[PDB]
């Protein structure tokens, strides 16, 4: 045998950073759940019982939080790049270091409507995450994305004109409910290493603000034919406005809501136009996935 | 053997609910999970295979959509003691209902500044929440909460002065974070039926509305000596504010954050006036409860 | 404003022990998670900011390390009286402990055909638990239940004879699918102290593997009528065998498993006596529950 | 822009089904959750609000158990063939259907030392899966896996000689608690079609069961030089005894048990030789992975 692929490391390192303004006394606080997996030439930690190649996974989160007390912990794409930098330069037999961040929202109070110096709600379990791989040799890849955004319209859905076959009971919609569990991921150009990923620091956050408002706009105010036809729509708009994306992923559950037909009950009308009152369903579920990426077709548009 | 108390009906109904203004072109959505059980001369199914004294759960669940078509689901207070009034109303030998509501938020969406008519956030995963017991001759005994706000304040909580002994490693601190999940109940007066809940309809939002705000700024401006000093001040607040609640609960986790010594690497400060890296702990957690009502001591007080 | 009620300390303590046979070589391990609330003369932390009367929660961590250090874990009822105990012994002002323990499976592997001295399988998520209050004055109450053991029979399940009118849809089954999540627990005689807790001990392995064997056996065995008849059974049989226990309780879901009818698609038949394929159903699902007791009626039986 | 990648389908398909043998009275049940996701000639659904070309999720779900019913469920890896193969045969347009099915334990009860006929236990929360990926043209890729098999040994860890720096903390250590969760992959050579598939089915079930028995020894006996020695150990048992698959893949997390000094107490001694009472970590873990093929090296070895 032969070791093919390995990485190790440290998983669900949780982590808050507090910034406190002496002048102003405006506190802001940050919080993380972070993994950082590493490759190399680790093979015989495998293969030998050879523990000298082994970087520590608790020495990995030792350096975690030293990276976040010595440098900021935002933009998370910037805090990523810098701790995956630290350990393939640190180690030279460390070769790549993978650096996945979920970030955890802490949104600052509203108390007799101004914002609070130092209080903070959870004001939604939505997440905005990184995956930085860094690569020894091959810069840094970046993917970015926002999860569990849950959302839902009660009406301006439709699906319609789907294949009709002896597998096929759905009955054709022009009006029904639209619910889902947006995760979007934009990818970003590689960059060189870590001075370029600075260099483009302020895109980050305004990129991450662009894709949720997108999100939200485009799911709002679409009349919707399809999961596929609205996430589409959300996806071309994302690239068009920041070009150092190269492609936008959309994975979208369809969450449905069933009417509930109660004709059987003293002629009680609770379909189509009168549909009122529905029922959930917590599975099964359509999910729904592209990835869509700037065209290069020059004919046969 | 002989059966000491027995109750059986149907759990983890989820319901959706929508009001279409056609005026207007406004929808307005309503999500729960609603149980009922149901309490009476029941004994015979347990003892003697007697399933003619069983209202069948299915049928429980039946009657839970067609009370939700048939009438408003909002206040859930209201709702749920329409939907208990039916069962023991409707059946000679049900002599209590139990219906307990979970409410989901659906919040509407602001797209450019404006509210959408029919686009929805789940902005939260705190839930209002009620326990509503229609006891056949006994009234009706509603307990409203919300559960599942989540904050966090970085400094203005303090904990020392506590008890120390052979058993304590406690350090004593002026200066902490505090962070926890917020379940609070109010229990209001015992209502004689449906009308009387009926006459105090506006005070159910009304008073959960309190309860939020008063949690919210209390927690985020008192200088805090403890969890337990903090939601007394709630719990006194909210009891102050609405004459026809009994008590108030609380029920509060202390959601630890620990200071991390770095002084073993380059001499990094991190600790104290310098703390801001932390390791947010999972578990164990403190936690802290209380029942506060009005006081009726007249001497030593 | 009062307190009417108090209580804290600290939850989701997380413990580990292990017993090592040194002649032999068989390590054996226990590992739970903790739970100790304590009440007593404690309202002047929340009215007063007086911490000197709160035993801090910390403490109460250490507490319980330290006595699983110095005591059997084994039986959970022993080690949460002893635990218990200690609070109200002691402090002279905590005056009651509410210990509940959660016990974890770590069943020996057998590895070829042979137990081994110390490798272990989580061979269920079933747990064993225990709620010991400890009362100054009062002596020991012991709840003892077994939970999430998770069941299903294929046939030998009836649902028929339950109450129709306008509210019924279900159809009544001569042979359906049942199955549940079993919570089961048993109420023990007041015991007086630790000494008569002692006393008693081995009764308290014996009697969770009665509860076990005879829930098994009659959810196996019995053509069930209905949840809340075999349920009933079940409860009896526990009663006739441990005089010790006042009450058994059982908590149980009806996790309904649907057939579904294929006749639409090439005259496939999948219902009644042709039902091979079934739609397992998260939700809803029926919640039935009772409290057996011994019978104290000498007329009309 | 253009659609890059999109794949569609229905997941969370709760699937059960039974086989009856009418001559010995004996049922057997199986319990799976399936997810098929299509791709195909279909990227005008999300460019053009093109139905037509999408095979309704519904439809799919509808395929599901319209398949389950028709053909064995078991092996998974058969099932999930048939599966996949259906769709891309079906449908000229559609060219892969990646079938994910997760199946549940269903363990038949012993009763009084014989094998219920009809009643069955989840023994575990563990999985056994099946990853089938079916392209047109390009045959069938199947990754089988066990999954959420938690194991815990007492002593026989170990692990030192691992790197020390300046970011290194962690004491070296010869008798340490081991325990993960334990999720392998077997990755099978590239089949041609569903009958190269049938060809093998005995194969299945004997190598899920080769994998998790070596998996179990391997744990048990191995005194451990670290997770990652004793990983490639299962890794280069299974390959050694399955001509047919071409890699093992381990994922495996370091669920840390420490150590607590409680010698400020009373001089109490728990850590090295006379640790008995240890902490569970929840979070951070380590996390190892390793994937392990065949060697092709002729020099150098
Ligand atoms: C209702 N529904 C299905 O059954 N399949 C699909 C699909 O692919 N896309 C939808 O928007 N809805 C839907
Ligand atoms: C830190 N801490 C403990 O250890 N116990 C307690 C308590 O009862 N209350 C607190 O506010 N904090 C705290
Ligand atoms: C199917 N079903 C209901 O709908 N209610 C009930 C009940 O009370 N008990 C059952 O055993 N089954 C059942
Ligand atoms: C304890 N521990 C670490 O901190 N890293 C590692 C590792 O890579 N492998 C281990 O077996 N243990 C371990």
Chains 1, 2, 3, 4 share one sequence.
Not at 75 to 104: D, M, Q, R
Not at 226 to 239: D, F, G, H, N, R
Request: net charge neutral.
């Amino acid at each position: 045998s032969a070791v093919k692929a390995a990485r190790y490391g440290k998983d669900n390192v949780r982590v808050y950073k507090v910034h406190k303004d002496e002048k102003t006394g405006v506190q802001t606080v940050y919080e993380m759940t972070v993994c950082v997996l590493l490759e190399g030439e680790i093979e015989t930690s495998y293969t030998k019982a050879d523990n000298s190649v082994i970087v520590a996974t608790d020495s990995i989160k030792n350096t975690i939080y030293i990276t976040a007390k010595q440098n900021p912990v935002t933009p998370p794409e910037l805090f990523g790049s810098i701790l995956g930098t630290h350990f393939i330069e640190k180690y030279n037999h460390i070769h790549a270091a993978h650096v996945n961040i979920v970030c955890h929202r802490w949104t600052r109070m509203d108390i007799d409507g101004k914002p609070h110096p130092h209080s903070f709600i959870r004001d939604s379990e939505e997440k905005r995450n990184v995956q930085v791989d860094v690569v020894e040799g091959k810069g840094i890849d970046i993917k970015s994305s926002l999860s569990g955004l849950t959302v839902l319209k009660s009406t301006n859905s439709q699906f319609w004109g789907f294949l009709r076959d002896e597998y096929t009971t759905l009955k054709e919609t022009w009006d029904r409910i639209l619910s889902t569990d947006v995760d979007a991921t934009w990818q970003w150009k590689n960059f060189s290493g870590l001075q370029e990923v600075r260099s483009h620091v302020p895109k980050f956050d305004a990129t991450w603000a662009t894709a949720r408002e997108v999100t939200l706009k485009t799911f709002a105010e679409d009349n919707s034919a399809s999961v596929q036809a609205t996430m589409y729509k959300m996806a071309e708009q994302i690239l068009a406005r920041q070009q150092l994306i190269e492609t936008v992923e959309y994975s979208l559950p369809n969450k449905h809501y069933f009417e509930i037909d109660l004709s059987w009950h003293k002629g009680l009308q609770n379909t189509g136009k009168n549909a009122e009152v529905f029922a959930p369903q917590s599975d099964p579920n359509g999910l729904i996935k592209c990835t869509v990426g700037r065209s290069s077709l020059k004919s046969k548009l």
